[PDB]
Write an enzyme that holds these catalytic residues in place. Sequence first.
Site, mmCIF file in Angstrom:
data_model
loop_
_atom_site.group_PDB
_atom_site.id
_atom_site.type_symbol
_atom_site.label_atom_id
_atom_site.label_comp_id
_atom_site.label_asym_id
_atom_site.label_seq_id
_atom_site.Cartn_x
_atom_site.Cartn_y
_atom_site.Cartn_z
ATOM 1 N N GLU A 35 0.809 -1.208 0.000
ATOM 2 C CA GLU A 35 0.000 0.000 0.000
ATOM 3 C C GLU A 35 0.852 1.272 0.000
ATOM 4 O O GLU A 35 0.576 2.197 -0.752
ATOM 5 C CB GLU A 35 -0.961 0.019 1.190
ATOM 6 N N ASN A 46 -7.340 9.846 -5.646
ATOM 7 C CA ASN A 46 -8.190 8.937 -6.411
ATOM 8 C C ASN A 46 -9.068 9.712 -7.385
ATOM 9 O O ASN A 46 -9.297 10.906 -7.200
ATOM 10 C CB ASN A 46 -9.073 8.111 -5.474
ATOM 11 N N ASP A 48 -12.218 9.809 -7.743
ATOM 12 C CA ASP A 48 -13.375 10.443 -7.117
ATOM 13 C C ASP A 48 -13.039 11.687 -6.291
ATOM 14 O O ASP A 48 -13.925 12.259 -5.650
ATOM 15 C CB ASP A 48 -14.169 9.435 -6.263
ATOM 16 N N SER A 50 -11.144 11.781 -3.625
ATOM 17 C CA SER A 50 -10.712 11.438 -2.275
ATOM 18 C C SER A 50 -9.214 11.129 -2.341
ATOM 19 O O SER A 50 -8.660 10.984 -3.441
ATOM 20 C CB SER A 50 -11.504 10.248 -1.736
ATOM 21 N N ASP A 52 -5.859 8.842 -0.349
ATOM 22 C CA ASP A 52 -5.447 7.759 0.559
ATOM 23 C C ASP A 52 -4.208 8.233 1.311
ATOM 24 O O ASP A 52 -3.282 8.787 0.704
ATOM 25 C CB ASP A 52 -5.124 6.490 -0.228
ATOM 26 N N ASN A 59 -8.544 5.907 3.313
ATOM 27 C CA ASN A 59 -9.314 6.827 2.467
ATOM 28 C C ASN A 59 -10.057 7.975 3.155
ATOM 29 O O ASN A 59 -10.751 7.774 4.156
ATOM 30 C CB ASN A 59 -10.281 6.006 1.602
ATOM 31 N N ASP A 101 -15.534 -3.500 9.855
ATOM 32 C CA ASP A 101 -16.807 -3.072 9.271
ATOM 33 C C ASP A 101 -17.568 -3.975 8.294
ATOM 34 O O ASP A 101 -18.585 -3.557 7.730
ATOM 35 C CB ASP A 101 -16.693 -1.629 8.742
#
Length: 129
Positions: A35, A46, A48, A50, A52, A59, A101
Amino acid sequence: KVFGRCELAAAMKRHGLDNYRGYSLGNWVCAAKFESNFNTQATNRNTDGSTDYGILQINSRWWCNDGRTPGSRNLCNIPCSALLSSDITASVNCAKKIVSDGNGMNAWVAWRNRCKGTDVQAWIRGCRL
């Protein structure tokens, strides 16, 4: 800070990640490797909008607030910058919420594509833990 493989393994173990939700330490070290290449300062934007952040590339749309991701849920209740610290505590604490989650470690694309189903034990081989 750019961690060493064993140095990171030891730090993660101390923060309670070894076997957290059934994921052995090798999975976490492998995920971090792919990562962020063990770099706490890693950031990636990203499509969209957003971003990281950190060693585990958490995110901004769901987990941390960076002041530039509209409609961001700040589920970990922290500024994304806290995730770039040389102290991995904030990153570890937030990762624990993420892995709990629903989809487990599948939340990390690099883990699913590069660690899942591999001999993750190799990532901690040779380390004095």
